């Protein structure tokens, strides 16, 4: 630990991950949540690009602070270190991705069918391993943990079709 020292920094990525997830789920200013609807459109293979409006994040922060709840400065953290927050947003989106309501109809892009095949295959592997370990008869949370540790899935990096981009703050609002 002496070769690679450590530094404490004001940023806490776990709290910011929670803030990102909450912002994605519960932003309504622009009926339903804006980004949830965008993710639904992505799932139906309509939109290939998710545009994270930083003005939305700023308004979310202002709403949270105005009501008194403490919300960390997500916009400033994004501006200071943008590269990491790309992957943070990408993983938060990948967790909250809904399921398609319109299946493959022989006219879908080959990328989409390959992604669907990979997703179904890794789900099948996970379920099969769960069934085997359950049948071994040695809570389902521990079973899920052991099967996800013991299986080699297609990583989530290879099952996402959308692209992630950030829109800078409008000068007039800021």
């Amino acid at each position: 630990s002496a070769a690679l020292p450590s530094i404490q920094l004001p940023v806490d990525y776990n709290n910011l991950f929670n803030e990102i997830t909450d912002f994605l789920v519960t932003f309504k200013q622009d009926k339903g949540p804006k980004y949830m609807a965008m993710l639904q459109k992505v799932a139906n293979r309509e939109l290939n690009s998710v545009i994270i409006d930083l003005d939305d994040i700023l308004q979310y922060q202002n709403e949270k602070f105005l009501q008194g709840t403490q919300a960390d400065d997500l916009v400033s953290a994004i501006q200071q270190n943008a590269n990491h927050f790309t992957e943070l947003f990408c993983r938060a989106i990948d967790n909250n991705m809904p399921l398609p309501t319109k299946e493959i109809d022989y006219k879908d892009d080959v990328l989409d069918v390959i992604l669907n095949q990979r997703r179904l295959r890794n789900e099948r592997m996970l379920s099969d391993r769960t069934n085997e370990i359950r049948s071994e008869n040695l809570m389902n949370d521990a079973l899920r943990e052991v099967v996800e540790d013991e299986t080699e899935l297609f990583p989530p990096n290879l099952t996402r079709r959308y692209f992630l981009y950030f829109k800078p703050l409008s000068q007039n609002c800021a």
């Binding site: 370990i133 040695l138 949370d141 521990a142 943990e145 052991v146």
Partner: peptide, 27 residues
């Protein structure tokens, strides 16, 4: 052993050693 420990955790392990006890003919 890993499987059993994780399963029974509900209310890392080193490489286990095998001990072989036999009753066969002794040279």
């Amino acid at each position: 052993a890993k499987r059993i420990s994780i399963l029974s955790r509900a209310q890392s392990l080193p490489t286990f050693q095998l001990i072989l006890n036999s009753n066969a003919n002794q040279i």
